[PDB]
Amino acid sequence: GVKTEQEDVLAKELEDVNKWGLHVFRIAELSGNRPLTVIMHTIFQERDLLKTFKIPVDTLITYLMTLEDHYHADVAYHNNIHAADVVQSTHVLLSTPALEAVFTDLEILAAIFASAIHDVDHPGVSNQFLINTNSELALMYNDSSVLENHHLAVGFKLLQEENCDIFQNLTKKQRQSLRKMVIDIVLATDMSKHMNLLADLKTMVETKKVTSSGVLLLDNYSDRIQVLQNMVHCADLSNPTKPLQLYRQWTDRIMEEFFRQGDRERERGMEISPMCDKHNASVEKSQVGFIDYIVHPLWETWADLVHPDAQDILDTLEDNREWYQSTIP
Ligand SMILES: COc1ccc(C2=NN(C(C)C)C(=O)C2(C)C)cc1OC1CCCC1
Ligand SMILES: [Mg+2]
Ligand SMILES: [Zn+2]
């Protein structure tokens, strides 16, 4: 009734679960490709979510196992490892000193559950690819946030599988509030909403208020959900803020996925999407452009909101940016 030796090495890696820079690829290897299940289980136990929401542990494991199985093992980036990474990154952001005692257990559950489902059943191609190919998903969702609508529908539908309803003991009021917040968070992961999310986060930093020394005041749903939306969006765009050994693995995987979409586009005689042409590729320049135009403006604004809690992450992002710049030939 004590762990195998592989389960021990996994348990020792999972001691890093509260730190930016977890060996998530090593956790994927040690868990038999179960990073999402073991990281979600660890976070739920750590935050006492099973007791708070009366989640039977067998139901939690069955749902997590089912959810993880609906991420595609043949997709290089948008897979269970990326889901596990965004969950664990959201978990660390929720622990930021500037947000201590700000969020309810229901809001914490929403942010973590949203992170876990936010890319489920991703086919490894973009919304524009799905729209241009007249795919069933684009037709179901009227070409609007096709993938993000689909991730939500699958994440919720999987609750109806045998012993998978982890919310079975929540009141209707709790379930309606959880459901609305999860939908609002995952729809905000659509990059077409990035500029509006960032504009609203900047407005909040300019008008920010702190109460009882240090900790953010968020007194309406609009502000509370905007911060959770930006938090999970930051977690989703967190790769360039990680130690470079992790960042380079994420860059290899996103480039494999993008080049594969570009190959699908070229073989069909479609216009090849930005950064998807492996014959016309500038990986280093693209990463510097990605950091300069998207990731740095977002994380700089987040860093202001929670000043100074995110200084080390912003420092790592700036170091990684200089490393990629220095390798442009
Ligand atoms: C590790 O590096 C990355 C991780 C995620 C992304 C994404 N890009 N986008 C949009 C903006 C196209 C997205 O939705 C996501 C967030 C999936 C991009 C990355 O870097 C690439 C940009 C151009 C080539 C290298
Ligand atoms: Mg997504
Ligand atoms: Zn994602």
Swiss-Prot record:
Belongs to the cyclic nucleotide phosphodiesterase family. PDE4 subfamily. Homodimer for the long isoforms. Isoforms with truncated N-termini are monomeric. Isoform 3 is part of a ternary complex containing PRKAR2A, PRKAR2B and AKAP9. Interacts with PDE4DIP. Identified in a complex composed of RYR1, PDE4D, PKA, FKBP1A and protein phosphatase 1 (PP1). Isoform 5, isoform N3 and isoform 12 bind RACK1 via their unique N-terminus. Binds ARRB2. Interacts (via N-terminal region) with SHANK2 (via proline-rich region); the interaction is increased in a PKA-dependent manner. 3',5'-cyclic AMP binds at H78, Q287, F290. It comes from Homo sapiens. Expressed in colonic epithelial cells (at protein level). Widespread; most abundant in skeletal muscle. It is found in: Apical cell membrane; Cytoplasm; Membrane; Cytoplasm, Cytoskeleton. Zn(2+) 2 binds at D119. Hydrolyzes the second messenger cAMP, which is a key regulator of many important physiological processes. The chain holds residues 385 to 713 of 809 of the full protein. Long isoforms that share a conserved PKA phosphorylation site in the N-terminus are activated by PKA through phosphorylation. Isoform 3 and isoform 7 are activated by phosphorylation (in vitro), but not isoform 6. This is 3',5'-cyclic-AMP phosphodiesterase 4D. Residues 2-329 form the PDEase domain. The active site is at H78 (proton donor). The gene is PDE4D. Mn(2+) binds at D119. Zn(2+) 1 binds at H82, H118, D119, D236. AMP binds at H78, D119, D236, N239, Q287, F290. There is a cross-link at K3 (Glycyl lysine isopeptide (Lys-Gly) (interchain with G-Cter in SUMO)). It is linked to Genetic variations in PDE4D might be associated with susceptibility to stroke. PubMed:17006457 states that association with stroke has to be considered with caution. Acrodysostosis 2, with or without hormone resistance: A pleiotropic disorder characterized by skeletal, endocrine, and neurological abnormalities. Skeletal features include brachycephaly, midface hypoplasia with a small upturned nose, brachydactyly, and lumbar spinal stenosis. Endocrine abnormalities include hypothyroidism and hypogonadism in males and irregular menses in females. Developmental disability is a common finding but is variable in severity and can be associated with significant behavioral problems. Mg(2+) binds at D119.
